[PDB]
Design an enzyme around this catalytic site. Structure first.
Site, PDB file in Angstrom:
ATOM      1  N   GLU A  52     -26.345 -34.054  58.571  1.00 29.83           N
ATOM      2  CA  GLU A  52     -26.890 -35.369  58.230  1.00 29.83           C
ATOM      3  C   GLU A  52     -26.475 -36.382  59.295  1.00 29.83           C
ATOM      4  OE1 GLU A  52     -26.630 -34.498  53.384  1.00 29.83           O
ATOM      5  OE2 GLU A  52     -24.952 -35.274  54.571  1.00 29.83           O
TER       6      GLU A  52
ATOM      7  N   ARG B 104     -27.818 -40.437  42.989  1.00 33.98           N
ATOM      8  CA  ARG B 104     -27.097 -39.995  44.173  1.00 33.98           C
ATOM      9  C   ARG B 104     -27.894 -40.414  45.405  1.00 33.98           C
ATOM     10  NH1 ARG B 104     -24.362 -34.609  45.879  1.00 33.98           N
ATOM     11  NH2 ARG B 104     -24.014 -36.192  47.515  1.00 33.98           N
TER      12      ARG B 104
ATOM     13  N   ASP C 249     -28.275 -31.200  42.952  1.00 39.21           N
ATOM     14  CA  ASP C 249     -29.379 -31.234  43.931  1.00 39.21           C
ATOM     15  C   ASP C 249     -30.557 -30.457  43.347  1.00 39.21           C
ATOM     16  OD1 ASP C 249     -27.938 -30.992  47.322  1.00 39.21           O
ATOM     17  OD2 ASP C 249     -27.483 -32.357  45.653  1.00 39.21           O
TER      18      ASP C 249
ATOM     19  N   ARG D 184     -13.809 -35.677  49.016  1.00 37.47           N
ATOM     20  CA  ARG D 184     -14.585 -36.883  49.304  1.00 37.47           C
ATOM     21  C   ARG D 184     -13.894 -38.065  48.634  1.00 37.47           C
ATOM     22  NH1 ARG D 184     -20.788 -34.296  48.796  1.00 37.47           N
ATOM     23  NH2 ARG D 184     -20.809 -33.468  50.935  1.00 37.47           N
TER      24      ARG D 184
ATOM     25  N   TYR E 286     -21.293 -40.060  49.587  1.00 42.72           N
ATOM     26  CA  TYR E 286     -22.419 -40.560  50.383  1.00 42.72           C
ATOM     27  C   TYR E 286     -22.435 -42.078  50.327  1.00 42.72           C
ATOM     28  CZ  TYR E 286     -24.637 -35.988  51.207  1.00 42.72           C
ATOM     29  OH  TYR E 286     -24.943 -34.712  51.625  1.00 42.72           O
TER      30      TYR E 286
ATOM     31  N   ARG F  53     -22.725 -35.428  60.484  1.00 40.71           N
ATOM     32  CA  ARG F  53     -21.879 -34.514  59.722  1.00 40.71           C
ATOM     33  C   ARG F  53     -21.882 -33.127  60.342  1.00 40.71           C
ATOM     34  NH1 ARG F  53     -23.238 -33.296  53.350  1.00 40.71           N
ATOM     35  NH2 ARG F  53     -22.029 -31.347  53.134  1.00 40.71           N
TER      36      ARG F  53
END
Length: 658
Positions: A503, A207, A232, A581, A615, A519
Site C-alpha cells: 500500500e 475500516r 475484509d 498496530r 490504517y 508498506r
C-alpha cells in the site's frame, strides 16, 4: 435523579483508596449506574479503577470491579462464589490515554439493570458492550461485600490490580439510567466521529479511512462501510463518504459512493467469541479500499475502489484472469450465463451482451449500473439478509426484489470471480456520485486486477496529471490520467517483493518530483522517487527511525503547504511499533534541497505507545491545521475484530507536532 454518592479528584498512585464508609450503606436495590471521569496516561498492565468486594478470607472471588488494561481495553468482573457466578465482560480499544501531550479525561458510564438483566458499558459516548444474562447478579448483592475501593480490588485484605491514574469524578446511582439519560452526560472527548454505528450507512463497522481537501475548502472523506463485522472481502461492504465545510468541525450524514444491493444494509452485532468471530458473509458482492483525488481541469472529484463479485475477496480471487477478453487492443467484460461451464459472452459498446461461441448479439444488455436487461426490461433477483438466530450465520432470501446485477450470486449473467477496480465521479463535491465504471485491465487479459492503494490519489500541482497508486506482485502500478480520468495508462515500478501488501501513498516534493511511501514485509516503510511526474521511478530505499510489524500497515502522507524550520515539510502517519498496530505517530520530515533527502525531525505521539493505531488518513485542512481520521485499534489482531466506533477523527496544529 441524583447520586447516592459523588466524589472526585482522587489520585491513584499504586495505592488504593477506601471509600467503604461513604458508599456501602448507600447502595440499595438491584440496579446501579456508575459514572466515572478518569485519566490514565501511564497505566499498569492490568488495573482496577473501582471495586466492590468481600475482603474476607475464603471469599477472594466475591467482587465487582471495573478494570482496564494498558492495551486500552475496558471491562468489568461480577463474581460470587456461592452463586457460582463469574461474569467478565470487556471490549478492547475503548480508551484514550493522551492527546496533544495531555492526559485525556475518559467518561465511563456503567449500567447494571436488574429488570432487563443487562450490563451495559459506555466510554466517551460509545457503547462498548451490552450483555444480557439468564441469571442476573446485582453488583452490591455479592455475598459478604464489605469494601468499596478506588484504584484496586481488596481480596482477602490485599490490594489486587493496583492502578496508576486519577479519578476526577465518580458518581453512583441506585437506578439503571436510560440510554437517553446516558446521552445527556457531558463528555470531554479529544476526538469526533464522522462515520458511526447507526448512521445512514447502517453498517455497524468501518475500516480504511481516507481524507482529501478540495479546492473549495470542503474536506471529503471516504471509508469502507463494513456490514459483516470488520472482515475484509468476501463480505458485504459499501463505500461511503461524508464532507465537512467548516474545517472538520462538523460532518455531513454519509451517502454511498459505491454500493451493491444483493444483500440488505443491516446493522448487525457480529459475534466476537472464538467459535463464531470468523463468520463471514459469503454470498454478497462488495467494494473494498477507496482512494480520492480532485481534478483541477474539470472540477470533478474522482473516487476509485476495488470491486468484488459475490463471495469473492483477494484470497479466492482468480489470479490468472483479468475478467476481460481482448479483441484488437480493446477489452470487454466477460460474462457467464446460468447453466454454462465457461464464459461464452462479453459486454460490448452500449452494453450489448454478445455471444462469443456464435459471435452474435443477444436480446440482453447491461445498463450503466451493471444491471441485466432483457429486451430493455429490468430483470430482478431476491435480496438476502443475514442473521445468527440459529446459532450460526445464515444468509437467506428476504422477499425483496432488487435489480439483477452481474456482480451478484443470483444473476443470470455473472462476471469472472476475480477483483476489479472501479471509478466513480462527483460534480458537486461529494453530494452525489455517478454510477461506477470498471477500469480496463492494465497488465494483460490473463492478469487479475491490481490492488488499489487506499487513501489519496495525487493531483500534480503544475499540470492536469492525475495518479492513483496500485500494487500487485513485484511492483507498484501507478495509474495515470491526463484527461480528467477519461483514459488511464499504467507506469510500472519494480519493487523487491513478491506478494507484499505494498500500500503506497504519494507526495509531490516539488514540481514534477513525486516521492511514494509504501508498506513492505521488512518492518520498515519503503520509498521511491519520480522526477518526471510519474513516468519513471527510482530504486527502493527504506526509512530508518520508524518501525512497523513484519506484515506492515498502510501509511498516509502529505506535503505540508508551509515551511517548517525554514524547510519544505512532509508529514507521515503510521503506527510506530515492531509488535502490533499501536503507537500511532505523525512524523514530520524536512526536505533537504541538495538531494531531496528527508530528515525525520519530529515524532508526535497520537496516543500511548500501547494503544491501538492502524490504517490512517491525513490532510492539511484549509486553515493549515491537520485532520487525522484513523483506526484507533489493532485491525490486525484477532482479539480486536468487530469493534464499533473505533475509526475516529482528531484535529491538530503543527505546533502540537513540533
Amino acid at each position: 435523579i441524583s447520586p447516592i454518592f459523588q466524589g472526585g479528584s482522587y489520585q491513584l498512585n499504586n495505592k488504593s483508596i477506601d471509600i467503604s464508609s461513604l458508599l456501602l450503606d448507600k447502595l440499595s436495590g438491584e440496579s446501579q449506574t456508575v459514572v466515572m471521569k478518569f485519566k490514565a496516561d501511564k497505566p499498569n498492565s492490568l488495573q482496577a479503577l473501582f471495586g466492590l468486594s468481600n475482603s474476607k478470607a475464603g471469599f477472594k472471588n466475591n467482587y465487582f470491579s471495573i478494570f482496564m488494561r494498558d492495551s486500552g481495553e475496558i471491562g468489568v468482573e461480577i463474581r460470587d462464589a456461592q452463586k457460582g457466578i463469574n461474569y467478565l465482560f470487556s471490549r478492547p480499544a475503548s480508551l484514550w490515554g493522551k492527546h496533544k501531550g495531555q492526559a485525556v479525561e475518559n467518561t465511563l458510564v456503567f449500567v447494571s439493570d436488574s429488570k432487563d438483566k443487562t450490563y451495559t458499558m459506555y466510554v466517551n459516548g460509545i457503547e462498548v458492550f451490552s450483555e444480557t444474562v439468564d441469571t442476573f447478579l446485582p453488583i452490591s448483592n455479592i455475598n459478604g461485600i464489605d469494601k468499596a475501593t478506588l484504584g484496586a480490588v481488596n481480596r482477602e485484605g490485599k490490594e489486587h490490580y493496583l492502578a496508576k491514574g486519577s479519578i476526577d469524578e465518580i458518581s453512583l446511582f441506585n437506578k439503571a439510567i436510560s440510554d437517553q439519560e446516558v446521552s445527556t452526560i457531558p463528555l470531554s472527548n479529544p476526538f469526533q466521529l464522522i462515520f458511526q454505528s447507526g448512521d445512514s450507512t447502517q453498517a455497524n463497522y468501518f475500516r480504511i479511512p481516507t481524507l482529501y481537501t478540495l479546492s473549495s475548502g470542503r474536506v471529503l472523506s471516504s471509508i469502507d462501510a463494513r456490514y459483516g463485522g470488520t472482515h475484509d472481502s468476501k463480505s458485504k461492504i459499501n463505500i461511503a463518504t461524508s464532507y465537512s465545510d467548516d474545517n472538520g468541525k462538523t460532518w455531513s450524514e454519509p451517502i454511498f459512493a459505491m454500493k451493491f444491493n444483493d444483500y440488505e444494509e443491516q446493522l448487525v452485532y457480529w459475534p466476537r467469541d472464538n467459535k463464531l468471530k470468523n463468520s463471514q458473509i459469503s454470498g454478497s458482492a462488495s467494494f473494498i479500499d477507496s482512494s480520492i483525488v480532485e481534478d483541477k481541469k474539470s472540477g470533478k472529484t474522482i473516487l476509485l475502489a476495488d470491486v468484488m463479485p459475490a463471495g469473492i475477496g483477494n484470497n479466492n480471487a482468480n489470479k490468472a484472469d483479468s475478467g476481460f477478453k481482448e479483441i484488437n487492443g480493446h477489452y470487454y467484460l466477460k460474462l457467464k450465463k446460468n447453466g454454462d461451464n465457461d464464459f461464452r459472452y462479453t459486454v460490448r459498446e452500449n452494453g450489448v451482451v454478445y455471444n462469443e461461441t456464435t459471435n452474435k448479439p443477444t436480446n440482453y444488455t447491461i445498463n450503466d449500473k451493471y444491471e441485466v436487461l432483457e429486451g430493455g426490461k429490468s430483470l430482478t433477483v431476491e435480496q438476502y439478509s443475514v442473521d445468527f438466530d440459529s446459532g450460526s450465520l445464515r444468509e437467506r432470501h428476504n422477499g425483496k426484489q432488487v435489480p439483477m446485477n452481474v456482480f451478484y450470486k443470483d444473476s443470470l449473467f455473472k462476471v469472472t470471480p476475480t477483483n476489479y477496480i472501479a471509478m466513480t465521479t462527483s460534480q458537486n463535491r461529494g453530494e452525489s456520485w455517478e454510477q461506477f465504471k470498471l477500469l480496463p485491465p492494465f497488465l494483460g487479459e490473463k492478469h487479475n486486477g491490481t490492488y488499489l492503494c487506499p487513501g489519496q490519489g495525487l493531483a500534480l500541482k503544475s499540470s492536469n496529471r492525475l495518479i492513483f497508486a496500485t500494487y500487485t506482485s513485484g511492483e507498484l502500478t501507478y495509474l495515470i490520467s491526463d484527461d480528467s480520468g477519461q483514459t488511464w495508462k499504467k507506469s510500472s515500478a519494480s519493487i523487491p517483493f513478491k506478494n507484499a501488501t505494498a500500500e503506497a501513498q504519494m507526495v509531490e516534493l516539488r514540481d514534477g518530483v513525486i516521492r511514494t511511501f509504501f508498506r513492505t514485509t521488512t518492518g520498515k516503510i519503503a520509498y521511491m522517487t519520480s522526477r518526471d511526474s510519474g513516468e519513471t521511478w527510482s530504486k527502493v530505499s527504506y526509512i530508518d527511525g520508524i518501525q512497523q510489524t513484519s506484515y506492515g500497515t498502510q501509511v498516509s502522507a502529505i506535503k505540508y503547504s508551509q515551511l517548517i524550520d525554514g524547510k519544505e515539510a512532509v508529514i507521515l502517519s503510521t503506527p510506530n511499533s515492531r509488535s502490533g498496530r499501536k503507537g500511532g505517530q505523525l512524523v514530520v520530515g524536512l526536505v533537504n534541497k541538495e538531494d531531496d533527502s528527508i530528515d525525520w525531525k519530529y515524532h508526535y505521539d497520537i496516543d500511548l505507545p500501547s494503544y491501538g493505531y492502524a490504517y490512517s488518513a491525513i490532510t492539511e485542512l484549509p486553515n493549515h491545521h491537520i485532520g487525522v481520521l484513523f483506526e484507533k485499534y489493532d485491525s490486525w489482531s484477532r482479539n480486536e475484530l468487530h469493534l464499533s466506533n473505533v475509526v475516529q477523527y482528531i484535529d491538530l496544529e503543527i505546533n502540537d507536532l513540533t
